[PDB]
Design an enzyme around this catalytic site. Structure first.
Site, PDB file in Angstrom:
ATOM      1  N   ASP A   1      66.851  30.984  19.969  1.00 39.86           N
ATOM      2  CA  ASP A   1      67.273  32.322  20.335  1.00 39.86           C
ATOM      3  C   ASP A   1      66.437  33.138  21.355  1.00 39.86           C
ATOM      4  OD1 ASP A   1      68.582  34.787  19.890  1.00 39.86           O
ATOM      5  OD2 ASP A   1      67.886  35.057  17.831  1.00 39.86           O
ATOM      6  N   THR A   2      67.015  33.433  22.539  1.00 38.26           N
ATOM      7  CA  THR A   2      66.288  34.195  23.560  1.00 38.26           C
ATOM      8  C   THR A   2      66.318  35.705  23.328  1.00 38.26           C
ATOM      9  OG1 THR A   2      68.260  34.218  25.060  1.00 38.26           O
ATOM     10  CG2 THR A   2      66.535  32.490  25.303  1.00 38.26           C
ATOM     11  N   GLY A   3      67.234  36.119  22.430  1.00 38.05           N
ATOM     12  CA  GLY A   3      67.393  37.516  22.071  1.00 38.05           C
ATOM     13  C   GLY A   3      66.400  37.956  21.019  1.00 38.05           C
TER      14      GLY A   3
END
Ligand SMILES: CC(C)[C@H](NC(=O)[C@H](Cc1ccccc1)C[C@H](O)[C@H](Cc1ccccc1)NC(=O)OC(C)(C)C)c1ncc[nH]1
Ligand SMILES: CC(C)[C@H](NC(=O)[C@H](Cc1ccccc1)C[C@H](O)[C@H](Cc1ccccc1)NC(=O)OC(C)(C)C)c1ncc[nH]1
Lengths: 99, 99
Positions: free
Chosen positions: B25-27
């Site tokens: 997850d980049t968020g």
């Protein structure tokens, strides 16, 4: 471009002309934004995450301009604390995670 | 490697011995896993998701093996709908997000 992930990948996008900053989220299925008024023709939805569920208003065939590209796609508007572009809009731009 | 985001980027990690499906997850600023219990020596934290604020147990120096790498990081346990490896381990693995 390449987002190295030491800072949050926040990018400025234009949703039906409005300018908004959104987080490029690989962990989100949808792109949920708040702060743009897109009209009375939505499908009501409910999506989940860390902290619980949230009611959304889904809009299909929306003009989106982000990172030199222009795409058409589904955006949901709702009381999301962070504006997010999830895999539905990141796949349209052909972005990917690389190791 | 390259993950194209059409399917959710979930992989297998072995957190201190134990196997877990985690979402790349980049968020996410941090990594939060559920269904594993790492012990009494932790520092309490509050993080915010889309439905609101949760409390997490933070464990520092957790040995991890994901893809071919053996790293050490900070892992948080708490109430997540999905196990997420956030930007603190992704940068440790050296992953990027590209267009
Ligand atoms: C804001 C959204 C985009 C994002 N949430 C998701 O991506 C979630 C991740 C999740 C996975 C498994 C269980 C619950 C939730 C997906 C959406 O909540 C749900 C998943 C779901 C299905 C059935 C019942 C309950 C939930 N999916 C969804 O809304 O759209 C699809 C494309 C799968 C139809 C999120 N990720 C991090 C914070 N919020
Ligand atoms: C994995 C969790 C950490 C992740 N939450 C975050 O990344 C959040 C949300 C966020 C994302 C993007 C922009 C701004 C804020 C940041 C964390 O909540 C918080 C920041 C914060 C604390 C208290 C009040 C307000 C903010 N960060 C955090 O606990 O960890 C550190 C070590 C960075 C301080 C999440 N939940 C759902 C999707 N992503």
């Amino acid at each position: 471009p390449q987002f190295s992930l030491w800072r949050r990948p926040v990018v400025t996008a234009h949703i039906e002309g409005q300018p908004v900053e959104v987080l490029l989220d690989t962990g989100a299925d949808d792109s949920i934004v708040t702060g743009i008024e897109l009209g009375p023709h939505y499908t009501p939805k409910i999506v989940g995450g860390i902290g619980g569920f949230i009611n959304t208003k889904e809009y299909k065939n929306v003009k989106i301009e982000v990172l030199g590209k222009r795409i058409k796609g589904t955006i949901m508007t709702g009381d999301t604390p962070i504006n997010i572009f999830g895999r539905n809009l990141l796949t349209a731009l052909g972005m990917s995670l690389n190791l």
